[PDB]
Amino acid sequence: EINPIPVVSAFNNGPICAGEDGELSATFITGASYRWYSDATLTTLISTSRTPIISSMMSSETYYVVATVNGCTSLADSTT
Amino acid sequence: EINPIPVVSAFNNGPICAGEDGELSATFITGASYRWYSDATLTTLISTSRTPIISSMMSSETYYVVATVNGCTSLADSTT
């Protein structure tokens, strides 16, 4: 059985005002797990949710997402 | 049948102000049960929920989580 590699895209709420809670989201892939990272090298894990909430953002920041399907991992996408 | 060992990660709401209700969460594993402990030795059980609520926290505290799948237990993760 040769499994396909899933493709996932990342998104956000558009510009947000400092002090507000930012939200991240990603495309839904049936059966996929998701992992969000703060590092470009994917070494620090933030959360494991399709749509995590980031409390009290005071400054611009970037996030990376990897989706996993049937043991196969997507390339990470990113959003700012 | 040889079952895999599940991997579960723990999270929280980020810094919270004293007197507020803190929340814990953990990665979702399909079919897993969850157990949260207050002790590093996993001897005191707090709750059995993926996302328990901790009322009125007045000080920093740490929690441990174990997920169980098909009778196999994960290593405990932790969050502060």
Side-chain angles (χ1 to χ4, degrees):
Chain A
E1 295 180 349
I2 302 170
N3 288 309
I5 305 303
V7 179
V8 62
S9 297
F11 305 93
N12 61 60
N13 298 114
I16 190 165
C17 186
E20 294 175 344
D21 293 339
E23 305 181 324
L24 300 172
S25 67
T27 56
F28 179 79
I29 301 169
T30 303
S33 66
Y34 302 85
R35 290 177 291 168
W36 290 89
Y37 297 86
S38 65
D39 294 331
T41 59
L42 307 177
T43 54
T44 299
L45 182 68
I46 298 166
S47 65
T48 58
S49 179
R50 189 171 66 84
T51 58
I53 309 299
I54 303 164
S55 298
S56 297
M57 293 182 79
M58 300 302 292
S59 67
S60 299
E61 184 58 284
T62 62
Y63 300 93
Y64 300 89
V65 62
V66 178
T68 303
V69 178
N70 297 323
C72 300
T73 59
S74 71
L75 298 176
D77 195 11
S78 65
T79 188
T80 301
Chain B
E1 295 180 349
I2 302 170
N3 288 310
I5 305 303
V7 179
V8 62
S9 297
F11 305 93
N12 61 61
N13 298 114
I16 190 165
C17 186
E20 294 175 344
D21 293 339
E23 305 181 324
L24 300 172
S25 67
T27 56
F28 179 79
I29 301 169
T30 303
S33 66
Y34 302 85
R35 290 177 291 168
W36 290 89
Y37 297 86
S38 65
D39 294 331
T41 59
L42 307 177
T43 54
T44 299
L45 182 68
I46 298 166
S47 65
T48 58
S49 179
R50 189 171 66 84
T51 58
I53 309 299
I54 303 164
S55 298
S56 297
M57 293 182 79
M58 300 302 292
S59 67
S60 299
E61 184 58 284
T62 62
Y63 300 93
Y64 300 89
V65 62
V66 178
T68 303
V69 178
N70 297 323
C72 300
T73 59
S74 71
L75 298 176
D77 195 11
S78 65
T79 188
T80 301

